[PDB]
Amino acid sequence: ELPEDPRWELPRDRLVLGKPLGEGAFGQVVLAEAIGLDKDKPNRVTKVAVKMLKSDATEKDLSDLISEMEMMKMIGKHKNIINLLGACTQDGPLYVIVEYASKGNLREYLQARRPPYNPSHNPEEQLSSKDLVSCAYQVARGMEYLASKKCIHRDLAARNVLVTEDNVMKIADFGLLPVKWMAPEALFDRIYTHQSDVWSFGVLLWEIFTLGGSPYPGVPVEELFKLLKEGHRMDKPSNCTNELYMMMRDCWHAVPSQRPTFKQLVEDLDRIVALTSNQE
Numbered sequence: 018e019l020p021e022d023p024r025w026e027l028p029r030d031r032l033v034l035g036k037p038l039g040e041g042a043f044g045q046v047v048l049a050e051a052i053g054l055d056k057d058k059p060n061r062v063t064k065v066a067v068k069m070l071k072s073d074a075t076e077k078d079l080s081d082l083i084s085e086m087e088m089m090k091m092i093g094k095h096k097n098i099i100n101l102l103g104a105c106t107q108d109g110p111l112y113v114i115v116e117y118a119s120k121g122n123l124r125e126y127l128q129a130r131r132p133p134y135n136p137s138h139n140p141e142e143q144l145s146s147k148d149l150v151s152c153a154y155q156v157a158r159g160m161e162y163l164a165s166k167k168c169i170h171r172d173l174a175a176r177n178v179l180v181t182e183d184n185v186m187k188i189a190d191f192g193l194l195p196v197k198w199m200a201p202e203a204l205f206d207r208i209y210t211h212q213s214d215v216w217s218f219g220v221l222l223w224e225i226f227t228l229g230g231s232p233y234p235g236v237p238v239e240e241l242f243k244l245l246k247e248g249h250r251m252d253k254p255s256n257c258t259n260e261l262y263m264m265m266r267d268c269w270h271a272v273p274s275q276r277p278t279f280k281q282l283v284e285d286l287d288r289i290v291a292l293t294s295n296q297e
């Protein structure tokens with residue numbers, strides 16, 4: 018069986034399992050309430066997300082779940098990633114307990130906040146110019162942290178960033194459609210690096226300032242890798258500054274070594290957030 022780890026072990030009865038949050042590839046996720054997660058305050062209830070194996074699951078799904086958990090232990094804590102909070106490993110089925118993000122993925126969040134095409138049946142308040150740039154900064158901070166711990170994401174996109182109740186951006190699914198976020202060298206040669214994540218961040222920036230737009234709209238998968246070699250880049254979003262468009266373009270450098278780092282992107286975005294007003 019799985020060995021115990023008392024750094025992360027929470028008893029099974031301390032977890033009140035709630036409604037489904039989504040069905041992942043490795044397993045199913047559910048909303049839950051953890052009693053006495055902070056052992057200093059044992060009478061408190063904390064809303065958490067809980068990952069478990071599906072009904073029709075195999076030995077490969079178990080080892081991938083265990084690998085994700087163990088990877089999350091090593092990477093450590095940061096405000097702008099989904100953090101490991103605990104695990105139930107002993108009594109029966111494996112539960113992996115992580116932070117909960119009540120507002121869902123960044124793409125749907127942004128799409129819902131478009132002016133009333135807005136696909137949501139429940140629209141929300143429009144995001145200011147400073148809010149959009151702040152979102153990019155936080156996502157860059159998370160990636161800066163992940164990169165500093167030698168973690169290569171391999172699928173950074175607005176759909177894999179989650180948003181908390183307090184509107185904190187959190188990188189999701191980092192311890193493991195998609196071709197349009199891949200750098201040419203990842204798409205062609207399967208070479209994933211921190212620089213290929215930087216390319217992906219550029220597509221994520223374009224998602225932010227299109228309020229969750231589909232990149233390369235109407236472009237087939239077969240056409241894209243040719244068009245990227247020819248030097249095609251996405252045009253500036255209608256409601257985007259030239260500075261922020263230049264940042265996307267720098268992320269989309271054909272030569273990987275010429276892309277900025279997340280360290281530098283965080284510094285550039287820090288300056289732009291200060292220079293951007295809330296009145297816009």
Ligand SMILES: C=CC(=O)Nc1cccc(CN2C(=O)N(c3c(Cl)c(OC)cc(OC)c3Cl)Cc3cnc(NCCCCN(CC)CC)nc32)c1
Binds near residue numbers: 038041120188
């Ligand atoms: C819009 C849906 C949406 O974004 N769904 C979604 C997207 C990605 C991931 C999930 C499921 N889930 C994980 O996989 N997460 C996750 C993550 Cl990101 C992870 O990467 C490090 C590792 C995990 O297990 C080890 C889990 Cl469970 C945690 C999580 C946190 N908050 C939510 N809120 C949905 C709260 C969504 C509730 N919505 C109403 C139906 C709000 C619009 N969902 C989480 C759901």
